[PDB]
Amino acid sequence: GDQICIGYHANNSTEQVDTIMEKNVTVTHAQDILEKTHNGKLCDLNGVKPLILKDCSVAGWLLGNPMCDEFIRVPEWSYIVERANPANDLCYPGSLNDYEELKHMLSRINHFEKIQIIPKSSWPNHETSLGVSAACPYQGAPSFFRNVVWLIKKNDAYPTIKISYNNTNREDLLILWGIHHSNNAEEQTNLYKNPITYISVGTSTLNQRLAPKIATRSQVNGQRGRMDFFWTILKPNDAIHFESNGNFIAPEYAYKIVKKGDSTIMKSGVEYGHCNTKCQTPVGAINSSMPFHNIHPLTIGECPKYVKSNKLVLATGLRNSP
Amino acid sequence: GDQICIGYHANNSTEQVDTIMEKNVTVTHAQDILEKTHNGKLCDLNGVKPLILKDCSVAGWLLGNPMCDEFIRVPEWSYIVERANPANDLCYPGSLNDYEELKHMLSRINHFEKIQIIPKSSWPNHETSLGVSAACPYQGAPSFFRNVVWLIKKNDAYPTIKISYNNTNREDLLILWGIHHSNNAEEQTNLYKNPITYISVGTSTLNQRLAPKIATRSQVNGQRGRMDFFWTILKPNDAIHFESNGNFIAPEYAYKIVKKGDSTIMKSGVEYGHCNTKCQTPVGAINSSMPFHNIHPLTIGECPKYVKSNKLVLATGLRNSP
Amino acid sequence: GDQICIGYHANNSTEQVDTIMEKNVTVTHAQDILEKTHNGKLCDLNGVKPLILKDCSVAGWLLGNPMCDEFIRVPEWSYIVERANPANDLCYPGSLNDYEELKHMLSRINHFEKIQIIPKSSWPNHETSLGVSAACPYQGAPSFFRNVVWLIKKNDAYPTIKISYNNTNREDLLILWGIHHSNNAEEQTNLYKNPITYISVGTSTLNQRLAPKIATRSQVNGQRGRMDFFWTILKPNDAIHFESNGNFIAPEYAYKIVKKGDSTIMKSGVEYGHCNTKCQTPVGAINSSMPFHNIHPLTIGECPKYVKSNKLVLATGLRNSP
Amino acid sequence: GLFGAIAGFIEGGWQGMVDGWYGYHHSNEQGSGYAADKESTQKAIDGVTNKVNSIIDKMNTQFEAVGREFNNLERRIENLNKKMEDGFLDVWTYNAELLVLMENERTLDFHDSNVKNLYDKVRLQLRDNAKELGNGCFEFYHKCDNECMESVRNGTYDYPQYSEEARLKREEIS
Amino acid sequence: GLFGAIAGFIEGGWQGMVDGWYGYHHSNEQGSGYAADKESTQKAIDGVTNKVNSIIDKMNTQFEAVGREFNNLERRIENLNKKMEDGFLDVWTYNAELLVLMENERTLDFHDSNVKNLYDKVRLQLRDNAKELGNGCFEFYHKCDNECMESVRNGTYDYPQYSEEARLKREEIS
Amino acid sequence: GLFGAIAGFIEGGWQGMVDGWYGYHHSNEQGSGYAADKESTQKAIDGVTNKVNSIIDKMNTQFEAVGREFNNLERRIENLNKKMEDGFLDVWTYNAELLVLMENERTLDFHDSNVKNLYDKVRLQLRDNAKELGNGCFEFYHKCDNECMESVRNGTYDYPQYSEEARLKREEIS
Ligand SMILES: CC(=O)N[C@H]1[C@H](O[C@H]2[C@@H](O)[C@@H](CO)O[C@@H](O[C@H]3[C@H](O)[C@@H](O)[C@H](O)O[C@@H]3CO)[C@@H]2O)O[C@H](CO)[C@@H](O)[C@@H]1O[C@@H]1O[C@H](CO)[C@H](O)[C@H](O[C@]2(C(=O)O)C[C@H](O)[C@@H](NC(C)=O)[C@H]([C@H](O)[C@H](O)CO)O2)[C@H]1O
Ligand SMILES: CC(=O)N[C@H]1[C@H](O[C@H]2[C@@H](O)[C@@H](CO)O[C@@H](O[C@H]3[C@H](O)[C@@H](O)[C@H](O)O[C@@H]3CO)[C@@H]2O)O[C@H](CO)[C@@H](O)[C@@H]1O[C@@H]1O[C@H](CO)[C@H](O)[C@H](O[C@]2(C(=O)O)C[C@H](O)[C@@H](NC(C)=O)[C@H]([C@H](O)[C@H](O)CO)O2)[C@H]1O
Ligand SMILES: CC(=O)N[C@H]1[C@H](O[C@@H]2[C@@H](O)[C@H](O)O[C@H](CO)[C@@H]2O)O[C@H](CO)[C@@H](O)[C@@H]1O[C@@H]1O[C@H](CO)[C@H](O)[C@H](O[C@]2(C(=O)O)C[C@H](O)[C@@H](NC(C)=O)[C@H]([C@H](O)[C@H](O)CO)O2)[C@H]1O
């Protein structure tokens, strides 16, 4: 007689899925929920370009390392890009205090503006032009950090400094200063004329006293001397008071800074690509809605959950037989 | 003929659950496993009352800020409640060393008791009633922290202090002291008569020597000077040895302290409710057995896991159709 | 007529499993995936034996506490086993700076060898045989840490020390030195003849200045004095520079050190067992492929996930009927 | 539906049955009414009761104190704590939402199987003595009193009794 | 699967079926062809689309910045961050892998159930008016039009019409 | 269970059957014994073994060194580590316990399904040549040797063997 049959779909498809009880099952249609693709470029994060320090560290950028490129106005950024080992960090050897907290705080900045707070004219009793070193060469000539001044004795005398700066701006100020550790007693007098010296820094919260550590040290960038740099945030209508009789690396520029959100520092050599994204990795940005990915763990932004997987394939069609 | 049928329950049910393959499915019976309700009060934690500082920080409470309560009414607390920005922290500007670790230790205290270790009669050669400041007002008059004494020169002389205290109690002692940073040389000699001063504090484990940092600073609470406070735990049968020739903020009262468990500090403006709970949140206590909640992440106690959900409704009854 | 039936396996099995709707269900076969057994001994971790300090702390071992055992020349270890409260830590009271970071670094070392860097003949104008204390006895006589030398004045004179050591080895050196804090002015001049003293230590990265803190302290191990020890990693071809006019605990031995991986310190009293494992706990090693265990949280190696459970019984057979 | 019972060969729901979840509706010479299978409906209730309690009581909770104890020079550690709290929120939120979706689907398919299991039990007893209409009812070929109806509900149906009578209404009606 | 329809009585899978997931194949004197159960496939299409979107959308994502901001004297804290990142990766990997395995099993039995639910939909209309072959096919005891073929797919089959006709080949053909 | 075989109409734990999981009980003239289906059981052994292995092998395990490396002035960081360890303990405990509970039911409904599948295979293998007793057993309408039953076990019985012969003894019992 007449015949009627019941059957399901099949197609030319070698797509594979796995189940809890059966391995290596071929299906008609399947979907992968594991993101594995990126654009290979560093992109803007939610419409804000990153601050790309080419080969400079944050400390060299902030202090004005002469080998680092001249300050270009980047009034805002969403994250900072450094190379794995920045070459130009501190041309004169030493340290920057609380460096990692400072780097974390500068990772995402809403407004960043460099201003002059103490011009080199404001040191009439001290030499302001001999503060140079072969460890900080510019155009082959000995130089120094741009944004600070290395004061030296004038007329074989170093009168005690007593200067203040009141923050009249509407925004917080990032201020950096330093102390120079000389190599021996003779070098201490040759530069500052005062054998025993100090530095005092005062604000509404900061109460700092520093003394030079005159000792024998190993040569770094050809110099046995050291400079220790320090920073503070001067809130509006507060003032910072400096006082020293030697070894003082005075600020000249400061930075008006407004901070709204948080980020981190990304280590990458990948180039900027004039794109936009909501999830960024050191190897490229991610444009996806998947819940999982396996590209890189050091992501910044709203990103899929990082897993150790090559594929997470979900069966949508029927079991396809050849 | 006669008929028998197979069917299932239906009722006046408008209640919708979602499945992995379907959404807005109306069922007969359902249950939510997400806790959303709290009593809106701060309660005891497993029978122990919290230490509720009204507008005082931990530092102001310990040192005896004049605008904070003078008598410990609670020998034991399960957690500490502070307001977001307490008004009475350190009337005289300065700092308290290792403040966050001290606060964490005091978060849950089994026994607390203020005792007098060094009476004011122990300073016969020093002034013990001129140590007041307009930064610490009390009833329209300059005052000072109640639990420490600001020693001043007497008869234009500040003899070297050499005093020791032995912990004859069976419990650990929390002891606080301080150093005063002068504003200038003239003020230093006006208060202590000794131009170069020091503070030495020694126990079996503590070994501290401090010198004042005489420098210009911004006015805070009307004062440019500062006081740095420090603390230690003096174990039973150990002694603390003090030596100073000026700038010494001596202890008068200490605290017998017994700690047997850990907690944290809760930031909340909610009022005490004379209730008990095993799970407290800044917005209210939780009385539940549910595995999940969405009330607040900053919980103290045995609490359900905090999730970002408005509903977790489990289907228990059958599918319901109108 | 003839008959054919359908049925399933049952046997004499009392295994009970739980399921999301039924409890205490008897099955034929069941498999427990919770790991519960350990060998009760401390083992090698991936073929590398641990460093077992018996009753010596890490600090006492590095500094050569005479009350501890002698250096038994362990070349390499995978993790460190300390007792809960080691008896011999610092025979002369004091501290070792950055102790926890030092222990974390030393937790797993690929090569370790003590070498002499500054022989005792390098101190001709100083006494090298008086630096002993009854707090560090050896065979009843007063002694001292074996790897450092406590230098004392000679002919009522303590000439200023200026000595450098260049790391000509191809491995990093771990170097330790100390400062001794005197009890009073007379004891200071009795030992060092110089009333005001300092220690300066410099490398390519280290710039350290220390001064003694002369103060009254409680007796520990019979002594009111204190010794603070410090450490640095001297890179190959770098040099360390020491300068002092008193209170200097000089290095004599250093340690060539190569670190390839990371580990932690295990606190246990369990005896070594001449075994091998991939997962170690303070109560014994685990040899399993299961994903979960309930033995101990403080594990070192590739271990199953720690859960709070007494059984995770997976039913693999059918429902059993007696 | 998976088992094709609630929306399969049954296509409604009995508002008039107020004493159980699964049951029977009879229609004989003595009238009509509803009756619920007490055993299969209690097996269902204790099931979902256990499922709800298993989801609740398997949650391990410990004492914890959650605060903000790091100052403005410890923001990196504070950020580390932030990534920890956010990570556990994401884990618990995803696991809770999917557990609800997966078990609700299993719960609704649990009722389909029980309903389809009750139909098969009646189908096995009646055999040729009744005709399957298709919607989940059986048209009896014989006279079924209220205790023949109860005989079906308590599973004590006597086939030899009505075996010949059902033949009289089966083939003799052409 | 569980319901015994993909690897049970039906040992096929029709490549010529290209406008649906489940369907029918008819064989009468007017020809042959493939027909799609648009109702059956639409429920399945929305079911797996909703399952895919639920796994995607229930995942809660927050802004995070993951870097390496601790220096060489903060290794213990750095190790704490390492243990945290490894812990979340292990949690997410294990749950994501097992989610795929468990729900792939449900999907492959969802299609298995749908085929069975469609085989019984055809069967319950035909009853003894047709004959089962044993390979997912039915042999009728009467002629079927292209309208009657569309009637079986529709669900509007008329048993009484061909019932008296079906007896002319059931007991007659011995 | 769900499909209704372990606790449905079979409702029998065959203690005397110790040779496998899924089988048959036969009672013909030549004797009475048991016999298992090689394909049905081996697909269940390979299923439960693959399920157990997938639960084990999917776990990513990494080298970790868990200690207590913070001192008494770093108690906040130690608390942060404690909340991290206890959080992961709670996450794994809940997932491990529920996964055991959830997949034990899927396991038992797998055995429950397979037993019913074997019954449906025999039902399609015998058809009108046999009756349906009710407890999973069939009453043959003809003589079945020990060679005709092996044609049923491997699934190769054809109508030529018994088409009219079964109809005789079927209609003899009237
Ligand atoms: C000036 C100089 O280069 N001096 C280096 C010194 O050179 C000597 C020798 O070669 C000597 C040989 O006998 O001859 C000297 O010249 C003689 C000549 O022989 C005669 O014929 C002639 O008639 O008289 C001459 C003298 O009047 C020649 O001057 O050699 C030593 C040993 O190699 C070398 O270290 C000297 O180089 C200087 O060393 C000092 C160390 O104290 C510093 O590192 C100097 O570096 C600088 C730097 O570039 O950073 C120089 C900067 O100008 C200076 N800046 C400031 C603000 O002071 C800094 C600063 O002093 C330190 O960094 C702070 O610690 O240092 C380095 O050039
Ligand atoms: C030398 C000695 O015994 N000194 C201890 C001192 O001894 C006194 C008392 O016993 C006294 C009782 O009234 O009698 C004195 O003897 C008299 C006696 O009265 C008469 O009967 C007799 O006829 O004449 C005698 C003349 O001597 C006796 O001299 O007692 C005090 C108080 O009890 C005790 O502290 C002295 O012990 C020394 O104390 C100092 C601190 O003051 C140190 O801790 C010494 O310990 C050591 C140590 O072992 O660490 C000694 C080491 O040799 C030394 N090492 C170096 C490199 O210098 C170290 C080091 O100085 C410190 O550690 C630096 O901080 O200290 C301890 O022996
Ligand atoms: C003593 C005083 O109030 N001086 C006051 C000064 O003198 C007024 C004068 O204007 C008025 O016309 O006559 C008055 C008497 O009739 C009186 O003599 O007025 C100027 C106006 O600009 C004020 O600056 C000045 O105020 C004092 O200035 C001090 C030095 O700067 C210091 O700040 C004083 O504050 C106290 C304080 O209240 O904290 C005064 C305390 O007694 C003192 N306590 C101790 C133990 O010494 C305290 C201490 O010196 C510092 O805190 C240490 O750093 O300072 C302030 O009143």
Ligand SMILES: *[C@@H]1O[C@H](CO)[C@@H](O[C@@H]2O[C@H](CO)[C@@H](O)[C@H](O)[C@H]2NC(C)=O)[C@H](O)[C@H]1NC(C)=O
């Ligand atoms: C330690 O000694 C080595 C050599 O034994 C020094 O290394 C040399 O340093 C000079 C000076 O810059 C270089 O020109 C040579 O190329 C180096 N040679 C080698 C083989 O390294 C090293 O500078 C010394 N270190 C210190 C801190 O003085």
Ligand SMILES: *[C@@H]1O[C@H](CO)[C@@H](O)[C@H](O)[C@H]1NC(C)=O
């Ligand atoms: C800075 O200037 C403002 C306005 O002139 C003043 O109110 C404020 O007190 C000054 N700050 C200090 C620290 O002197």
Ligand SMILES: *[C@@H]1O[C@H](CO)[C@@H](O)[C@H](O)[C@H]1NC(C)=O
């Ligand atoms: C405190 O007094 C006890 C009383 O026995 C004494 O043993 C102890 O040494 C004293 N503590 C000191 C001196 O630090």
